[PDB]
Amino acid sequence: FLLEAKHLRDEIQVNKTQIPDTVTQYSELYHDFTTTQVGMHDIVRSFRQTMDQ
Amino acid sequence: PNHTSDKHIWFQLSRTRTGKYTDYYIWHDCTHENGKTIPPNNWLSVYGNSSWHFDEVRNQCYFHQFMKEQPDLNFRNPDVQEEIKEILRFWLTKGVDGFSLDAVKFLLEAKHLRDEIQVNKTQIPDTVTQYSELYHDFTTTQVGMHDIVRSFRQTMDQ
Ligand SMILES: *[C@@H]1O[C@H](CO)[C@@H](O[C@@H]2O[C@H](CO)[C@@H](O)[C@H](O)[C@H]2NC(C)=O)[C@H](O)[C@H]1NC(C)=O
Ligand SMILES: *[C@@H]1O[C@H](CO)[C@@H](O[C@@H]2O[C@H](CO)[C@@H](O)[C@H](O)[C@H]2NC(C)=O)[C@H](O)[C@H]1NC(C)=O
Ligand SMILES: *[C@@H]1O[C@H](CO)[C@@H](O[C@@H]2O[C@H](CO)[C@@H](O)[C@H](O)[C@H]2NC(C)=O)[C@H](O)[C@H]1NC(C)=O
Ligand SMILES: [Ca+2]
Numbered sequence: 380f381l382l383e384a385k386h387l388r389d390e391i392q393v394n395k396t397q398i399p400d401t402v403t404q405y406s407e408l409y410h411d412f413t414t415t416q417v418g419m420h421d422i423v424r425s426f427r428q429t430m431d432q
Numbered sequence: 433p434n435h436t437s438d439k440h441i442w443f444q445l446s447r448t449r450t451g452k453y454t455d456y457y458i459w460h461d462c463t464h465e466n467g468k469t470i471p472p473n474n475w476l477s478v479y480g481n482s483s484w485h486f487d488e489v490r491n492q493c494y495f496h497q498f499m500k501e502q503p504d505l506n507f508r509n510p511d512v513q514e515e516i517k518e519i520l521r522f523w524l525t526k527g528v529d530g531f532s533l534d535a536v537k538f539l540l541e542a543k544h545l546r547d548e549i550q551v552n553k554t555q556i557p558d559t560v561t562q563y564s565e566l567y568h569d570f571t572t573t574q575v576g577m578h579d580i581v582r583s584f585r586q587t588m589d590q
């Protein structure tokens with residue numbers, strides 16, 4: 380959950396015909412812009428490098 | 433390193449399901465009938481209409497970033513990476529002093545094969561054909577491409 384997308388775009392609904400204002404459960408959206416972004420593994424490797432001292 | 437030609441021996445062996453060559457290219461099932469093909473998704477090519485093209489021998493659709501005659505390789509298969517490393521070593525041992533890699537942002541693509549977000553949300557889904565009418569979040573700069581580039585650098589370091 381470290382990094383998130385910078386373009387701040389909406390995520391794809393699992394139920395494409397569901398009304399946009401009736402979605403409140405975390406399991407009703409595909410999480411492509413909020414989890415496992417580009418650069419998180421670099422942060423983890425930086426933590427490992429810091430611990431290597 | 434991203435793609436080869438459809439006249440390459442690798443693609444000729446792949447389209448007939450011959451050994452380990454069966455999985456050097458991104459293949460997927462599709463519906464072709466009465467001279468019309470339904471692509472798995474709405475991904476568009478850089479130079480044209482669709483990124484998925486049907487084939488007769490395999491009865492499946494293959495993936496091309498640029499043109500229908502340029503099948504895209506599969507970098508999720510370690511054998512392709514080994515072949516690329518072999519080519520790099522072959523060219524390095526002849527005296528070449530350096531390489532300039534072309535189109536490294538197009539290496540990896542998303543595995544979930546989900547539609548991309550339209551720029552014009554109210555545009556009719558079947559009237560989108562220009563590469564500039566879609567946000568490219570699932571086809572460019574995926575997770576792991578930089579690792580492939582670093583692997584290339586490690587190979588060259590020898
Ligand atoms: C969630 O998906 C299901 C199918 O996967 C659908 O549910 C139907 O949607 C219709 C549309 O009006 C509604 O009548 C009901 O919600 C469902 N069918 C019936 C009549 O029971 C739809 O894609 C999504 N559901 C909703 C809330 O529309
Ligand atoms: C593929 O792309 C073309 C061009 O982007 C689209 O329109 C075709 O354009 C050529 C060039 O003049 C015409 O010869 C075709 O008749 C056009 N196709 C039509 C009108 O359906 C179109 O999206 C695609 N065309 C083809 C032939 O696949
Ligand atoms: C593309 O976006 C523009 C605005 O950004 C919109 O274009 C209007 O869409 C309406 C919907 O029917 C159509 O009348 C015209 O295409 C445009 N308006 C007028 C009155 O010309 C819309 O979001 C998208 N365009 C299309 C093709 O619908
Ligand atoms: Ca965070």
Ligand SMILES: [Ca+2]
Pocket residue numbers: 434497504505538539540541
């Ligand atoms: Ca590729």
